[PDB]
C-alpha cells in the first residue's frame, strides 16, 4: 500500500537454511512488476 | 580483536570466503606475544593461499 517498489517481501520457497558455504550480492537492478497489456515488451537471456 | 572467546572444547570456527587477508601486520608488525608456523614461512603466506 505504501512505497510499492514491487520488492520481495516474504521468502516461501525454503523454510530453513544452514551450513552455508557461499553468499554473494550482485549489482543493483530495476524491476517493475506492474501489470501491462500487449505483446511482451522485454527480453532477458541468461547463460549459466 | 574479539572481546571474549569460547571454551577450549567450545572453540568457534570463523569461515572466511571471498575475502582478502593481510598477513603482514599479523606477523611482521610483531604486535603479538608469539607465533609458530608449520610447513610454511610466515612471510610466504602473502603470495600463497
Swiss-Prot record, chain B:
Changing residue 34 to A: In strain: Omicron/BA.2, Omicron/BA.2.12.1, Omicron/BA.4, Omicron/BA.5, Omicron/BQ.1.1, Omicron/XBB.1.5, Omicron/EG.5.1. Changing residue 26 to I: In strain: Omicron/XBB.1.5, Omicron/EG.5.1. Glycans are attached at residue 1. Changing residue 29 to F: In strain: Omicron/BA.2, Omicron/BA.2.12.1, Omicron/BA.2.75, Omicron/BA.4, Omicron/BA.5, Omicron/BQ.1.1, Omicron/XBB.1.5, Omicron/EG.5.1. It comes from the Viruses. Changing residue 31 to P: In strain: Omicron/BA.1, Omicron/BA.2, Omicron/BA.2.12.1, Omicron/BA.2.75, Omicron/BA.4, Omicron/BA.5, Omicron/BQ.1.1, Omicron/XBB.1.5, Omicron/EG.5.1. Changing residue 33 to F: In strain: Omicron/BA.1, Omicron/BA.2, Omicron/BA.2.12.1, Omicron/BA.2.75, Omicron/BA.4, Omicron/BA.5, Omicron/BQ.1.1, Omicron/XBB.1.5, Omicron/EG.5.1. Changing residue 29 to L: In strain: Omicron/BA.1. Binds to host ACE2. RBD also interacts with the N-linked glycan on 'Asn-90' of ACE2. Cleavage of S generates a polybasic C-terminal sequence on S1 that binds to host Neuropilin-1 (NRP1) and Neuropilin-2 (NRP2) receptors. Interacts with host integrin alpha-5/beta-1 (ITGA5:ITGB1) and with ACE2 in complex with integrin alpha-5/beta-1 (ITGA5:ITGB1). May interact via cytoplasmic c-terminus with M protein. May interact (via N-terminus) with host bilirubin and biliverdin, thereby preventing antibody binding to the SARS-CoV-2 spike NTD via an allosteric mechanism. Attaches the virion to the cell membrane by interacting with host receptor, initiating the infection. The major receptor is host ACE2. When S2/S2' has been cleaved, binding to the receptor triggers direct fusion at the cell membrane. When S2/S2' has not been cleaved, binding to the receptor results in internalization of the virus by endocytosis using host TFRC and GRM2 and leading to fusion of the virion membrane with the host endosomal membrane. Alternatively, may use NRP1/NRP2 and integrin as entry receptors. This is Spike protein S1. It comes from Severe acute respiratory syndrome coronavirus 2. The chain holds residues 343 to 391 of 1273 of the full protein.
